Design a binder for this molecule. Structure first.
Ligand SMILES: Nc1ncnc2c1ncn2[C@@H]1O[C@@H]2CO[P@](=O)(S)O[C@@H]3[C@H](O)[C@@H](CO[P@](=O)(S)O[C@H]2[C@H]1O)O[C@H]3n1cnc2c(N)ncnc21
Length: 1336
């Protein structure tokens, strides 16, 4: 080995000794160190044995021949040089290990081998090096090497194909367990779903099944066993030891991958330095440059692959951790004791299964960086120290200064997040009031007053939004300025400290790239530490939960079908609490009806709990015989259909089910319910009354067909007749359970004489049990008891911002881009200056221009960021105003017809998406896009002839981005949807655990929780593999960019300078992260901007007639006398109102009578123009209503509706939202409304803060407040809608409103009789038109 023929030569040939020693020791050596380790995996992991195939044999036969050929060399050598003996024998022996290895891999079930692939690849490269040397040298021993190389190449090609699957069916399988090594490395096996997801929108059944190891049925038992072993071995069992003993061995493979990734990441800058030296070192061979470029490419590709495999390992381990923790928590919760369960909140345990398990899932990613981040940083620092000197300390002095500052920013906006949120809550509250009370507002035309309050709350919100906006600007400013800041600081210090310090390309750009690989190892440290602390508290929470005690099954001697036996048994609800049932003894024979009798808190329900092993048995002997059906006091209802509630996971028997349903008198309940017995009962579905829930619980118990029934007050909530019917057909001796041992807890005497045995107790003690007649004859405790009683959406958003602001932001951001680019170009020009008299010709003016360029970059970064901040706030204001106007201008038919509920999330969730997320997303997406464009242009500018690589790589990027965004924003939705049922099922199980355990159906519910967690994992796993697929494709694109940039710089290093090549390579190295985040941000934008599209709704939705016409406005006293005339009125709704020709004279009391379905109420809607007249000419006095603007008439006519709607705020704002009427008028109207006494009583006087809907006020008061509103209006036309205070409101409407014309729609004839001229409506027609005297 000497440098003349290997390094400094036109023809670089490895020396003969090097060829025969190191190039042969490398591959043979690889298999020798891996062989032992590989038995661990081959042994621990097995999948059967693969059959005898031609491929496997072909590989084995070539392994035999290859060994022979290599030993044939030893034979010829035997037929001087020491290397001609040991090397052939070593190669033959490692070859014999290779063929044995494919043999054992067949035995252990391996379709494709990564070892048997990397090993052949390394051997091939070594053979290639010797091959080239041997063909450049030119029979005797050469031909043996050619045969060896050809066989090795064919072996390598064979090793790529995947063998047949073993005899270990698998519908919709996961191709991970069947794909070959190359597909697993490149993650190609998911591209199928990627293309298919782009064409056919994914559903829950298209998702692949889970591999056997990820199923909860294979990860929960191992954790359960390990935790049991630790618990039985122990003081204070530790969950962390269990965790790292159970899933640690699979996790430790991440360590190697992380170390290799770190080393390969650092290998980049070293090769960059070598290339910068090469371009500066003219008169050097081109072979060195091409070797350096190939080294860069191979290192980058290998680092990408290893890192992405590391990512997959960590995510799979986290998924297993989550699944196992979920399963163990479920089983523990099903086992733990009531005493230990009551202390912890139910919501606490649900949080235990949600937030702590999710934190454990996410922790697996940032746990290796506990050592990767420091070492990286340290190593990077050392390299930087090797490069420049102590001055670099000042260069990083600001990076470490950004870690706290940025943190301080985030925490700050969190407080802002708390402020904004608070105001938003108020806003939505107010909006909710308007949404459920839009009827009253339109009637009084108070819409604009409420719009003003909404705008005031919006101003309050936008103040905090403006402050957060200004804070966000500097956060972006620092992020973009960091690179320039570190470069300028370190370079200025380096130049100023000593004039002999020469700034070369290697001394500027290598340290510049080391700064880029320093940003990440340092900025993630706070996140890592915070996640570790949260995971530690989660470990504490899980450990204390999993160490809880449990109920004792031994307490009850459950025996297969003297039925219930208790002797001298005392039970507790806790270990230290006193007994609740002291010294209980009783024997219940088979098929006997026993009633527990006592007062409240006696211990009746405790007896049934004790028979189910729910109480803590401190002493005694209980021998319940046969299956037990428990009807609890608090009915537990599953959210499944009523049929499956009664069935309870049991085979449906139509005759038995139909005998059970009516015997519980559940037939009326089935009839009222919409779908019958298929209705979704429970908290989530249709709510049921308590009696119905008790009925369903009893029906479930009766269907379960147990021999022993424990009925803890099944008839508490059912009525007396229903209860007697139930007892007759179910519990009584002539019911369904005639031969069943029934034990009932009751406090009702009605069925007591029919009971075979009455167990009467007092204070948890057996007190003279016996039969009813005998107990009555004894006249003791029982007698005492008885005696007790789409590109256009982007343009729309730009218009909402305004064209000027958007254009200015784009221009300033382009200015930032050009400033950064010219900063880089200035650095390149600066690094190329010659050295005269031992110092650069120019070094102060270059620093000044560098500083000026960077300061300009910083000011424009802070500027355009502030622009979009103001723009975003402007757009939020304009969009909210437009949406509010469209909503309030729409007719009532819109509110009635629209799904009531889709407006609320539009005002709350989508508006929140607009004002906060959209500006941040547009900022970071635009930044990433122009970072990519800047990398491309600085590559193309420095090397003009590099435009041939842009088209293919752009096509690859476009295809990958299209497929990923389309197929990932759907997988995320699938996973989100699937997550909720797990926590819902845990809530159901937690709520019904006593019933679950009593029926002994805990195994079925354990299996059910298996399915839901597996379903969630089936959608979560493709998402992370999708991220990996993005990752590999985009890093391949970036590595191709790096390779082509370096290649095109090396091919023309002469017409180029060192600094230009350095800058090109540094930016090409950076471009990969920018590309990845550009795709991720584009996906974010695509699913985010649609909010604006759904906020631009109701833009054309038919609106009401204009509120103010102002061309045909009425006079101030429009209702001069109040002469109403319905001239052929017809109201569309086919026609509810038809042929209405009536005349109500001014100041004449008129009422409207009719049955349900008539046009009584619709007639009022005619007066106020709620629905446009299909055919009609209603005219008040001498003016048509349809011509008048809505507000005008709605202000000149008043209505007292069915249910008065009192809005949140003061009483004065309820009476006069506009505050138009003076305080004296309000006081007079309130006094005239029989409310002066009450209104003077509130401490806040007229400013009494009434809650949502006036909950604090009574219904009578709210009605009188509505009457006060009508009285304060002082209008000549008033309408009344009648449904205790009726006497008061009727007298008040008869007191002073006699001057005004009053229409009255009352469902009661008593009040209408007083009003003359009654109009009767049969089906919209005027049945009778005359006074009540003419009516009778
Ligand atoms: N191997 C690696 N080496 C270098 N860095 C790596 C990395 N892997 C991950 N990153 C991260 O990718 C981003 C790289 O920077 P960019 O891609 S140039 O821009 C960021 C990014 O686009 C997104 C968030 O990406 P992010 O996860 S937060 O963090 C950084 C970086 O830490 O928004 C931008 N961004 C970040 N902060 C701000 C801000 N205050 N104002 C405006 N835009 C901001």
């Amino acid at each position: 080995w000497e440098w003349n023929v290997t390094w400094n030569t036109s023809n670089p040939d490895f020396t003969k000794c090097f060829q025969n020693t190191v190039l042969v020791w490398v591959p043979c050596s690889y298999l020798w160190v891996c062989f032992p380790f590989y038995f661990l995996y081959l042994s621990h992991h097995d999948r059967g044995y693969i059959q005898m195939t031609h491929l496997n044999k072909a590989k084995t036969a070539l392994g035999f021949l290859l060994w022979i050929v290599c030993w044939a060399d030893l034979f010829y050598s035997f037929w001087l040089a020491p290397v001609f003996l040991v090397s052939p024998t070593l190669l033959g022996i490692t070859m014999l290990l290779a063929t044995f290895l494919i043999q054992i891999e067949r035995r252990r079930g391996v379709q494709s081998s990564g070892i048997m692939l990397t090993f052949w690849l390394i051997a091939l490269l070594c053979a290639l090096a010797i091959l080239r040397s041997k063909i450049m040298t030119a029979v005797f021993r050469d031909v043996t090497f050619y045969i060896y190389f050809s066989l090795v190449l064919i072996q390598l090609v064979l090793s790529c194909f995947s063998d047949r699957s073993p005899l270990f069916n698998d519908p919709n399988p996961c191709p991970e367990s069947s794909a070959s090594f190359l597909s697993r490395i490149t993650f190609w096996w998911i591209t199928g779903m990627m293309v298919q997801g782009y064409r056919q929108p994914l559903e829950s059944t298209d998702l692949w099944s889970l591999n056997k190891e990820d199923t909860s049925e294979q990860v929960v038992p191992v954790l359960v066993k390990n935790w049991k072993k630790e618990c039985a071995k122990s003081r204070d069992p530790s969950l962390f030891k269990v965790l790292y003993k159970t899933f640690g061995p699979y996790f430790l493979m991440s360590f190697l991958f992380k170390a290799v990734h770190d080393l390969m990441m650092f290998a980049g800058p070293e090769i960059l330095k070598l290339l910068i030296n090469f371009v500066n070192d003219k008169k050097a061979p081109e072979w060195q440059g091409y070797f350096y470029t190939a080294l860069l490419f191979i290192s980058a590709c290998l680092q990408t692959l290893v890192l992405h495999q590391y990512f997959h390992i960590c995510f799979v381990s986290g998924m297993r951790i989550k699944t196992a923790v979920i399963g163990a928590v479920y089983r523990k919760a099903l086992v733990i004791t009531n005493a230990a369960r009551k202390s912890s909140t139910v919501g606490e345990i649900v949080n235990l299964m949600s937030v702590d398990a999710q934190r454990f899932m996410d922790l697996a990613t940032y746990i290796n960086m506990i050592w990767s981040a420091p070492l990286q940083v340290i190593l990077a620092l050392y390299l930087l120290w090797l490069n420049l000197g102590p001055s670099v300390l000042a260069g990083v002095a600001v990076m470490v200064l950004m870690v706290p500052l940025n943190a301080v920013m985030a925490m700050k906006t969190k407080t802002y997040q708390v402020a904004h949120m608070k105001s938003k809550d108020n806003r939505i509250k107010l909006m909710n009031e308007i949404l459920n009370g839009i009827k009253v507002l339109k009637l009084y035309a108070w819409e604009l007053a409420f719009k003003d309050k909404v705008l005031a709350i919006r101003q309050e919100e936008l103040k905090v939004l403006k402050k957060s906006a200004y804070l966000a600007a500097v956060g972006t400013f620092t992020w973009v300025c960091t690179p320039f800041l570190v470069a300028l600081s370190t370079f200025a210090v380096y130049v100023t400290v000593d004039e002999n310090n020469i700034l070369d390309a290697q001394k500027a750009f290598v340290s510049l790239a080391l700064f880029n690989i320093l940003r990440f190892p340092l900025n993630i440290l706070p996140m890592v530490i915070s996640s570790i602390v949260q995971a530690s508290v989660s470990l504490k929470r899980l450990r204390v939960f999993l160490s809880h005690e449990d109920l004792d099954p031994d307490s009850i001697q459950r025996r297969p079908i003297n039925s219930i036996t208790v002797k001298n048994a005392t039970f507790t609800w806790a270990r230290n609490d006193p007994p609740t049932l002291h010294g209980i003894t009783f024997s219940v024979p088979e098929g006997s009806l026993v009633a527990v009798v006592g007062q409240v808190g006696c211990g009746k329900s405790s007896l049934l709990s004790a028979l189910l092993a729910e109480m803590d048995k401190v002493e005694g002997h209980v021998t319940v015989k046969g299956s037990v059906a428990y009807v609890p006091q608090q009915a537990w209802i599953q959210n499944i259909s009523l049929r499956e509630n009664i069935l309870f996971g049991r085979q449906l028997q139509e005759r038995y089910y139909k005998a059970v349903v009516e015997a519980c008198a559940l037939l009326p309940d089935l009839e009222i319910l919409p779908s019958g017995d298929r209705t979704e009962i429970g908290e989530k579905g249709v709510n049921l009354s308590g009696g119905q829930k008790q009925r369903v619980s009893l029906a479930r118990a009766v269907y379960c067909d147990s021999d022993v029934y424990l009925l803890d007050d099944p008839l508490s909530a059912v009525d007396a007749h229903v209860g007697k019917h139930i007892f007759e057909n179910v519990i009584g001796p002539k019911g369904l359970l005639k031969n069943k041992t029934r034990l009932l807890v009751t406090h009702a005497i009605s069925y007591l004489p029919q009971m075979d045995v009455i167990i009467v107790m007092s204070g948890g003690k057996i007190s003279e049990m016996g039969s009813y007649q005998e107990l009555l004859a004894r006249d003791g405790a029982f007698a005492e008891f008885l005696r007790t009683y789409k590109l256009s959406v982007y343009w729309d958003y730009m218009k909402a911002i305004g064209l000027f602001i958007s254009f200015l932001s784009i221009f300033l951001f382009l200015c930032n881009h050009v400033a950064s680019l010219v900063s880089n170009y200035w650095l390149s020009l600066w690094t190329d200056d010659p050295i005269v008299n031992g110092t650069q010709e120019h070094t102060q003016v270059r620093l000044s221009v560098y500083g000026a360029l960077g300061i300009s970059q910083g000011i424009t970064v802070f500027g355009y960021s502030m622009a979009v901040s103001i723009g975003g706030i402007f757009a939020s204001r304009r969009l909210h105003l437009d949406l509010l106007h469209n909503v309030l201008r729409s007719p009532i038919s819109f509110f009635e017809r629209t799904p009531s509920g889709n407006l609320v999330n539009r005002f709350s969730k989508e508006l929140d998406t607009v004002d906060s997320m959209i500006p941040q997303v547009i900022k970071m997406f635009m930044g990433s896009l122009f970072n990519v464009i800047g990398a491309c242009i600085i590559i193309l500018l420095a090397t003009p002839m590099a435009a041939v690589i842009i088209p293919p790589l752009g096509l690859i990027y476009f295809f990958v981005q299209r497929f990923y965004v389309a197929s990932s924003r759907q997988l995320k939705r699938l996973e989100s949807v699937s997550r909720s049922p797990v926590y819902s099922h845990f809530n159901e199980t937690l709520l019904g655990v006593s019933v679950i355990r009593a029926f002994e159906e805990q195994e079925r519910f354990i299996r059910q929780s298996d399915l839901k967690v597996d379903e969630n994992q089936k959608a979560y796993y493709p998402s992370i593999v999708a991220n990996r697929w993005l990752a590999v494709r985009l890093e391949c694109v970036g590595n191709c960019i790096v390779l082509f940039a370096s290649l095109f710089a090396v091919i023309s290093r002469h017409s180029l300078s060192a600094g230009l090549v350095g800058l090109s390579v540094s930016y090409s190295l950076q471009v990969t992260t920018y590309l990845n985040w550009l795709v991720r941000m584009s996906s974010e934008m695509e699913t985010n901007i649609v909010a604006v599209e759904r906020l631009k709704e109701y833009s054309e939705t038919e609106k009401e007639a204009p509120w103010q016409i102002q061309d045909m406005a009425p006079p101030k006293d429009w209702p001069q006398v109040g002469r109403v005339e319905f001239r052929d009125y017809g109201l569309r709704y086919d026609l509810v109102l038809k042929h209405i020709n009536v005349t109500i004279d001014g100041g004449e009391k008129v009422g409207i009578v009719g049955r349900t379905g008539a046009g009584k109420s619709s007639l009022t809607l005619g007066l106020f123009r709620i629905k446009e007249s299909a055919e009609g000419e209603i005219i008040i006095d001498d003016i048509n209503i349809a011509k008048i603007g809505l507000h005008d008439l709605r202000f000149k006519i008043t209505i007292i509706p069915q249910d008065p709607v009192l809005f949140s705020g003061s009483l004065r704002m309820n009476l006069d939202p506009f505050s138009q009427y003076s305080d004296e008028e309000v006081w007079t109207s309130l006094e005239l409304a029989h409310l002066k006494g009450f209104v003077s009583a509130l401490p806040d006087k007229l400013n009494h803060e009434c809650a949502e809907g006036g909950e604090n006020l009574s219904v009578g008061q709210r009605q009188l407040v509505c009457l006060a509103r009508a009285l304060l209006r002082k209008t000549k036309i008033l309408v009344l809608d009648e449904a205790e205070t009726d006497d008061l409101i009727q007298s008040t409407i008869r007191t002073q409103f006699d001057d005004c014309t009053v229409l009255t729609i009352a469902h009661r004839l008593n009040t209408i009789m007083d009003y003359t001229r009654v109009i009767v409506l049969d089906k919209g027609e005027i049945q009778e038109w005359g006074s009540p005297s003419d009516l009778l």
